[model samples]
Target: NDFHRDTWAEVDLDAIYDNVENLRRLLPDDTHIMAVVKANAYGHGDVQVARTALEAGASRLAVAFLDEALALREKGIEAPILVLGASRPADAALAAQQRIALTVFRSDWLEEASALYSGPFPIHFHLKMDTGMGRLGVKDEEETKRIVALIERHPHFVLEGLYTHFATADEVNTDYFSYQYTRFLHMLEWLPSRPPLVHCANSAASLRFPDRTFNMVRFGIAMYGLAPSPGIKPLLPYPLKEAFSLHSRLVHVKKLQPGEKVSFGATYTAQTEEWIGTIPIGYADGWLRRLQHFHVLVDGQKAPIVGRICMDQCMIRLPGPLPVGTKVTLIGRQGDEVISIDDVARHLETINYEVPCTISYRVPRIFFRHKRIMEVRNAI
Candidate 1:
């Protein structure tokens, strides 16, 4: 009950399950789905999301770093977990010992690792080709070929997979996507022997181009019911059931004097006597000051915010006087209306996926399954 304190994020495992299973149905039967569970499962709580996703249909997991992979492993997840970012060669020993796969992009990375690890077991590694993301990975075919042969000869490295990321798969145009696909294919021709897996399709490509759904797909944001971008939302075969909702209680309510100004810097002033509601959520909780012009739901009614958002509190202009403890839907539905993650992202001038990930730990996460509470986590 303490978790209900003022503000929290609600996640429906049922929705998450449906989202992943739906995506799984579209992929080839033999094509492996690697659930991307990095960034705290895109800020949806890693352990629970990982377990539920695997249970639903995901065959494996991919995280951005070694620590993220280790977190999943520590939680008793024995499934194949791939760390999809760079790690020190010395650190590669522990990843190998744990049987976690790592992304290797350079020849010297293997060199550093080869000298450090004597092989408790051969380290499982993959090359992340820089086919235009301009991030990690070898760019030139010569360099890529050189590194591949280097890993093949190394006693400690077991090259199990090779992959590249799509830079414009979510856009309406496929020009950049096609270029990257072609680039990846040309790079593959340089390989003396292809690994067991050659993954390219992420959420965007998997939903749009079946031809790109090679041997594997990184079922990331889409598996959590979020489109890779809003442009790609309409492209999904079925409507995705978004798993996250945000809610809070109205902790205080008061009628504003006609000329009263609200919050720091007096950013907003009441033109007439207004019923102001105070919610225990602010920038510290990731209900940012940028949301000042946005709206919340009070008793299912649109209540426009009117204040400079404070550190731990903000004021909303209610339609009328609402009782303290009235449920406020900050980023979810109420009655016949809903405030979506996209709405928040639009107001903040950011991407829909950034909405939930930006929410601070000060706001608790209350996870539910089949409309019943299953677990609660609070950073406080």
Candidate 2:
């Protein structure tokens, strides 16, 4: 069962607009920006964020699956969408019907998709070249030539674009990025005629190396105002304002006497009389046990979490006996203090891109502008 609980995420639409708008101006005037809204826009709400991005000059949207592409179509998004991963042949008819494009790496998958779905509108696709990611794509020239011939002969499939992904574009090292780019260029030379769109730059490459900005670029994590990599920080043309923040309220507060323990295993004990507050968010909501090393924001001050994080709640040491219902910030600004997604990434020993995408769906996503709730998505 899903609950419309108090624990929620506050998303600032203005921040979303600010980030994309800035990028549109910075990128080449005719270059297309495909907003990657996969993983629910990296857990920032796909539909809302996609809409905001398009309005701010994004040329199209991209996702990781056929189902994700269909989700946008269901919400009435008619913009061109390309699915960037493997898609089942069984789902081909509907995907083709909606004019959703799929990524192709093999002749067999294309043959399978063609046999299953004979369409009034054929399955359109971007041929993914295995430049260096070593994932879903064609490598050798013969393989590329064979796939191109298949698409040309089969009216059921239409080849619309070609692209490759960079493995180390996000890293400071240029050796691998250059190697991948050169390899992709070699693959492109095999093409008899240039497809309408040829893309190579992801957010990292687009920001770090503008000269390589292909006709289209995937404006992904940067669309949400988060750094693609720490190394790219110095190269950004402008500062990016974060759009999402996790907010909850203290539901219970109690005074812990000396020797009092908190959470499971009694891992945390009070040295003196202290105040502890319980919040209605837990590991189940993506606040995992590893986060015990970190702290949340309360009363404009830092409050260290005091015990093993529970499935539906966690305890934090308070400076004093704060009243119930005080705002508790897990990843955002509270008073003068801030807990960025970067902080969460450092705490979890991961990247900022992985942090927000893991936030559980049980929490409602609240869209805000002018300090008001414009929309509420009870994802539970």
Candidate 3:
């Protein structure tokens, strides 16, 4: 028996491959793709999805942390992996030892790193520029010049690339986008004639601002067959398919009398004598308590989730009878009805990143290919 019952997420590798190919067609001929497979492929199983991404033309891969990069190495991935986030100066030696590319934004970081790793290890690194994202990286011209001079002096490290992240590339407002772009270009002109590689396009910039495809593009959410944002939906040239779907089954059914309460806190009261079905999914499985009022598709009809979502269960108010084992579509299509990540994001007042990433590993992910189950990570 499936120990945890009803709740599980399905990952469609075919849809993922299709999304990669679609994004590939949008890039320039020589522009390489660094598929962002960090966060377990944005909660879609990292090892499998990374293999599929490489098969679909991704020349490189990126992660958000050092351990994430190590996870890929443990899985035997030989492609170059870039760690896009900051790491402690103490961990710089480990990064060099593992041969993973690190992001450097300050001169002090290099001063510390050089002292830690005495020998030449060819530690690859990207100098991040803080254009408008007031976050990491050097923001002024003097810092850029100093960093460039340091890169020339240091032979133990390689200035692998120069890049910057956009603060609002997906927004309709072009003023900030243009300002960041101009700043990035100015920094590029000040750098050495032959910097290792220049790249500054995320999924949003890749699709909307084609004119800014410097030399490489990093694809994150879009590679998982999801739109960057609602504003950039129509900007995509080819149709993309969603790679994940959430499903669960009805575990129990009961007829509730009018004015009867359900679940914890008694937040919902039955307005009429209605048939209520319980599903074995809740906050523990990444189904937030706020989802109690969201609509789920069941047997070609829309059913509203009623009452408070518990740690292991939640109630769905059905109009009439539903089979005890009827399948419920929590984040995908069923017959003529559909619910997407975007829908869930809108309801939770968040973005697509949180919606899928929050689907905890406690919920088993069943992988599918050619409409057949390829592998199943059975729940403990």
Candidate 4:
């Protein structure tokens, strides 16, 4: 039964549900929460996580790509799914046919999209106006006006919402955030009676700037119970628990004599006679090679990862002894010790977003609910 021995990622649906409830409680009455299920729900298995988020009070779902939307649709996720990323002009008709909402910022995109889809399909769309992110959306007021005029003239498309992404909402610099908010508000003022829905708050802004909660809030990382960054932790009112955990089991244990080299390249040498445990997880499973110097929890005690982590395994220097089958907590809580994604981010010189996203699909994800295995994404 344990033929394919390897490390696996455990996704706690209850934790995800709790997180969604926390976010929902923070939202004002009548304000809808759009769960960002993009990047396969941040590598937590899209359909499973999306279902959990919806059950937990998410109004709708948002993905970054058309294929992701289509996948959700195939899985029977009928709720309005918004593709936040730019869709190819050629694929607009396909998106319309698939009943997936597309984000439009340019007049040419609208024109092309209209021409491609023959049916009078009620293509729900979000008009994006570039405020300060410098990514997509119309930057100039004239361009925005032109797009709105075209939307008014077009019958196939409906301007369901208007949105803009914040550039520095999470940072200490409030100047750009204030400027983007003002610009977004100004554009809304010019709209013909304001679009039915207006959203400008990402997870960062939604927590820090409650006033920016216009019609809806795009709950991205925060929906999964994570702050946008370490500096923004003090600003959140509700506690967010991490929904996913990385875990592995020790495959073998051996005693290393003093001055004995461990693993490839002899990156680490035993300072004293010690027990070293080898786990069946490595860089291949998203445990980066740089984490060779990190720590894993074994027997509820910290064990330093020793030597260069390999593609299929990593060695940890155990202070005393650890059983072969001991559970290794790579990024989660064990007793009083907690290893968070923030810790991994700190080690990798990255952010929390990348920490979870980096977990490859090659690692099996076992979904748990009510302390039972609800489903297992059999990744091999």
**Cα lDDT for residue 187, candidate 4:** 73
Best candidate, lDDT: 2
CA lDDT, every model vs. true structure: 0.86, 0.88, 0.86, 0.84
**Cα lDDT tens digits for candidate 2, 286-370:** 9888999588999999999888999999999998989999999999998789999999999999999998898988888888765
For model 2 the TM-score comes to 0.97
Pairwise TM-score winner, candidates 1 and 4: 1
lDDT of candidate 3? 0.86
- The local lDDT score (0 to 100) that residue 222 gets in candidate 4 is 82
Off by over 4 Å in 4: 1-3
Clashing pairs in 1: none
How far out, in Å, is residue 59 in model 4?
A: 1.2
Clashes of 3: 0
In model 1, which regions exceed 4 Å deviation?
1-4
Candidates in descending lDDT order: 2, 1, 3, 4
**Cα lDDT tens digits for candidate 3, 261-330:** 9988898898889999999889988999878789999998899999889998889999798889999999
Error in Å for residue 109 of model 4: 1.6
Error of 3 at 222 (Å): 1.1
* Candidate 3 TM-score versus the reference: 0.95
Candidate 3 stretches with Cα past 4 Å from truth are 1-4, 378-380
